[PDB]
Design a protein around this ligand. Structure first.
Ligand SMILES: *[C@@H]1O[C@H](CO)[C@@H](O)[C@H](O)[C@H]1NC(C)=O
Lengths: 49, 50, 49
């Protein structure tokens, strides 16, 4: 019984970690896109000035 | 900015073709119900006396 | 056998988590450097204008 409970806990933790990794990758892609757009706007403003 | 794609957390038994191994451990049924003797334990012992 | 398999799974998960933490720290340092450079450029542009 204890081994089954521990296995279920480990499986739940693994699923949670997979979801966390997916959400982290999505958020990092979004942040990278935002930073690229910010750098482009900065370069444009500097050139215009 | 490296992507988090190479992280594959493995499980124990996600879907191993649904084995469903039936153990059916009958350890409680392994009792020795020993039979009694041929008597002369309470009847003869009380009838003989001294 | 089940305990050994579970221990191996836990060790693999721990190694993966360590690698994830290292990569996360590296990416956060990179993002912090990018944000610092962006703030410096913003201050410079504002002062120049
Ligand atoms: C992890 O590996 C298993 C088999 O090794 C595969 O079925 C699964 O799709 C992989 N998951 C990810 C997120 O790469």
């Amino acid at each position: 019984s204890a081994l089954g409970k521990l296995q279920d806990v480990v499986n739940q933790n693994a699923q949670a970690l997979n979801t966390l990794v997916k959400q982290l990758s999505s958020n990092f892609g979004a942040i990278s896109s935002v930073l690229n757009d910010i750098l482009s706007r900065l370069d444009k403003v500097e050139a215009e000035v | 900015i490296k992507d988090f794609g190479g992280f594959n957390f493995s499980q124990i038994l996600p879907d191993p073709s649904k084995p469903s191994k039936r153990s059916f451990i009958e350890d409680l049924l392994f009792n020795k119900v020993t039979l009694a003797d041929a008597g002369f334990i309470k009847q003869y012992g009380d009838c003989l006396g001294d």
